[PDB]
């Protein structure tokens, strides 16, 4: 089966809003959730990192900002771990530069299952959401599925591969979304 | 002709807040709302949760962490300069006896007459899960009309989540 990142309603909206407010700059933040079995990453929530960085490096991550935010979120019942990071590339589309690879490396050190999410919030206004999620591949480094090998090779080519993305919503959120509409 | 424009994310965040804190039957949750109030329509674009405690058996005792509003707003200012502190929300379902008093304390953080959003989190009714209030002498709550305005990025988000 295919590993899949499940993104909750507020996570998607906060991402979209933050990416849009940062145009023309690449903006960035952290994603909170949980890892489950091997085919499942839940993104429950997200928060923005300040644009202190010139661009989107490991340096753009504000350790004291992150800790202060995690601490205050905890006091209001948000207690999930960091499951990766997201960043926007405005108009550039969904993929990773070499700098993003490096940023992602440093996230994988902390946690082997860490995910990188790219949003293009400009292209998203065409009436469809342009997001994807990515991981590095270098661990794995006669029936088969042809499109899975085609991908596993382009993967080795650029040093990373994509994950499926889905959206979760509670029945309550569903009801509420139907009124915000 | 006072009107409120509410972004969907704000309501979704009230909801998520109320659910994650396991908010018991009769209890309520409380937060801060952020947006723009320099014009005749009030733009509510964001929110964040507060630690908050009341006494179910005594409605005149309640605790709001002032440090926390200060420290959080400070951090919101670092990501978006334009989103100011304009009011507060709670989960209701109706106006509570201590609300005027709570409202008075939020005045010290806002630059308007603070807006009170009562968010219906129980969804047991027909349309907009939100009623907007402002305090006024005429001290008593005035119902204001409100509506949903979504900056395009959010709007196709909301429609992508429903398809």
């Amino acid at each position: 089966t295919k590993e899949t990142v499940y993104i909750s309603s507020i996570a998607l909206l906060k991402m979209l809003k933050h990416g849009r407010a940062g145009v023309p700059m690449e903006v960035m933040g952290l994603m909170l959730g949980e890892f489950v079995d091997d085919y499942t990453v839940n993104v429950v929530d997200v928060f923005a990192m300040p644009q202190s960085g010139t661009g989107v490096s490991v340096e753009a991550v504000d350790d004291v900002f992150q800790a202060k935010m995690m601490d205050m979120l905890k006091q209001t019942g948000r207690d999930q771990m960091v499951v990766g990071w997201y960043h926007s590339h405005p108009g550039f589309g969904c993929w990773l530069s070499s700098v993003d690879v490096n940023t992602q490396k440093s996230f994988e050190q902390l946690n082997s299952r860490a995910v990188a999410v790219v949003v293009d919030p400009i292209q998203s206004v065409k009436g469809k959401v342009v997001i994807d999620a990515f991981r590095l591949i270098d661990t794995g480094a006669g029936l088969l599925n042809k499109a899975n090998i085609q991908a596993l090779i382009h993967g080795l080519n650029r040093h990373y591969y994509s994950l499926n993305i889905d959206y979760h919503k509670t029945a309550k959120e569903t009801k509420m979304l139907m009124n915000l509409h | 002709h006072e009107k409120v424009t509410i972004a969907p994310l704000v309501l979704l965040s009230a909801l998520d807040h109320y659910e994650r804190t396991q908010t018991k039957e009769n209890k309520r949750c409380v937060g801060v709302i952020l947006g723009d109030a320099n014009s005749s329509t009030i733009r509510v674009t964001n929110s964040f949760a507060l630690p908050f405690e009341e006494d179910e058996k005594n409605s005149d005792v309640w605790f709001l962490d002032h440090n926390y509003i200060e420290n959080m707003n400070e951090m919101c200012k670092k990501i978006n300069a334009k989103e100011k502190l304009i009011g507060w929300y709670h989960s209701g379902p109706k106006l509570r006896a201590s609300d005027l008093k709570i409202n008075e304390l939020f005045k010290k953080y806002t630059q308007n007459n603070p807006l009170l959003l009562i968010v219906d989190v129980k969804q047991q009714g027909v349309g907009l899960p939100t009623d907007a209030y402002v305090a006024i002498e005429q001290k008593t709550f005035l119902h204001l009309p409100c509506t949903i305005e979504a900056e395009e990025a959010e709007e196709i988000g909301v429609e992508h989540l429903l398809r």
Partner: nanobody
Amino acid sequence: VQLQESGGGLVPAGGSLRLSCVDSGRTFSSTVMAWFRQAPGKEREFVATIRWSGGNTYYADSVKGRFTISRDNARNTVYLQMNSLKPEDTAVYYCAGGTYYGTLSYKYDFWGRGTQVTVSS
């Protein structure tokens, strides 16, 4: 109420129980069933989760190697088989359903009323 738990009761330490939950499927559609448990004066705690289609399963650490969750999806039933029971497994057990495959109680959509398991000390 759509979910109805069953099984459960008093068992000695070391003993075995099989909990079941039947879903009537009349208000909530679900792709995921979970068991949760709540001991008095503790938080609700995640036990195990399963996908209706596929049967993928996930377990809480304190429960691995001894509990098994499974589902008879033509019969709309979920099972929690509990072996090697310890007194700290005493709690009310709730099945829940929704679309979130994971651990967080507030991400589930509907709840049974719970069934008491008492493991003798």
